[PDB]
Amino acid sequence: REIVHIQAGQCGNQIGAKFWEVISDEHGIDPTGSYHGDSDLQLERINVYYNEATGNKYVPRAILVDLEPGTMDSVRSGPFGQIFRPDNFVFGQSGAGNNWAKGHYTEGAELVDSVLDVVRKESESCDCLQGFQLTHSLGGGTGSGMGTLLISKIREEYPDRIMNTFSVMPSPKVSDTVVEPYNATLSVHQLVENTDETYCIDNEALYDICFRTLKLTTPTYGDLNHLVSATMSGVTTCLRFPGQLNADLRKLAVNMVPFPRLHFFMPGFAPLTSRGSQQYRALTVPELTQQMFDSKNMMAACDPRHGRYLTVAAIFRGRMSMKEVDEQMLNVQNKNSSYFVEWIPNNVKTAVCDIPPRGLKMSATFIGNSTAIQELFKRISEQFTAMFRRKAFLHWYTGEGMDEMEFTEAESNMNDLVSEYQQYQDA
């Protein structure tokens, strides 16, 4: 059951590269693609994410995409950059200028067939393709505009495969341009229709965590991406390793999404750690459980107590008592039962994996489908309309052939998404 990974644009390729660094280390693959590994749990499901090449090398099933060559050069210059298959670098030259319209309609359209050709080659070698995972931001032009263009075309050619994304939401606290709310809103409209699951990675939350919890005065994208790579490693655990669950992307979708459009997840992680500085006391299973459910550990800047959990998936990594894990997980639900919808019985499922992530003896990763995610979309909707009511900065988009009407439809669809999440928060 092979997954095809695609990373698009500046943010997509930077968090994409970190993800492949991190899970390669967990599976015992070095920058050359060779396995110098301790345990054999590391290789049992290694084919979900890695093609095997002659000479027992492991090559990521990864495609790197950008309309601008710069950050893909840095990836190839990067530590594990030599592990990626060079044919799977697909890039243009003109960039996207932080413009969804250029990524989606004019620049990205010129390049998208070359990417689909690379997607096809990787898929035809798959015994049974699960589907795809895309890393991208929603605030730029390439990951957002061309990424959602790729999703739409991938769906046309593979309509029975699962589409999963890790989507980084823009925040004024960590912001490149004023038009991010425009790019994000146009993208969400695409994500609502064309993904089965998207992890909402909120740059607001990543910033708040670094500043407040990790006491990092001036957080860089490097500090943000340490959080992102830890979250990506955790939420993938049950796809990559053998366990009592043996999950795949479709089963995750079936068990997490009660209504098709409500497929946007708040990820959570514990313990929260900053890069480089290690702390030497492991948590207790009781500590892991409380931190993973704490709003201060959510990667989407929403208060869970402002909504209800439709479904939750939790994964505990490290050598620990599964009895204690079970008791602590039962404890949080029984003590906080009002925050779990009563009409989905037993909507919390826990998995355990023996292999911990690098640098931690124990970790807990949280995947929540909460109606509180609507706060994220409301925040973006306010920033959109603040400019849109004066049609501010629109010429960047009408200059690529876009119409105001398209902005009105995307805003209206995202408002409907907020309404639907509100509908189930009271039931």
Binding site: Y105, T106, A109, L149, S152, E156, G399, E400, G401
Partner: protein, 67 residues
Amino acid sequence: KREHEREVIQKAIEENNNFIKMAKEKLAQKMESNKENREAHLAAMLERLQEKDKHAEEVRKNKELKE
């Protein structure tokens, strides 16, 4: 959605082309009327200088008649 995608890029091509077209026609019309107007002004200037030669001939004629 594919239909709408190529209509967007065709629209972008059509606006950019139309802008190029109107700029080219605008200055072609501007340079044409500028050339006419300047020539009309120079033509009027010569036409009045030439009238000064017509008048100067008449002046000498009247002097001859006075003999």
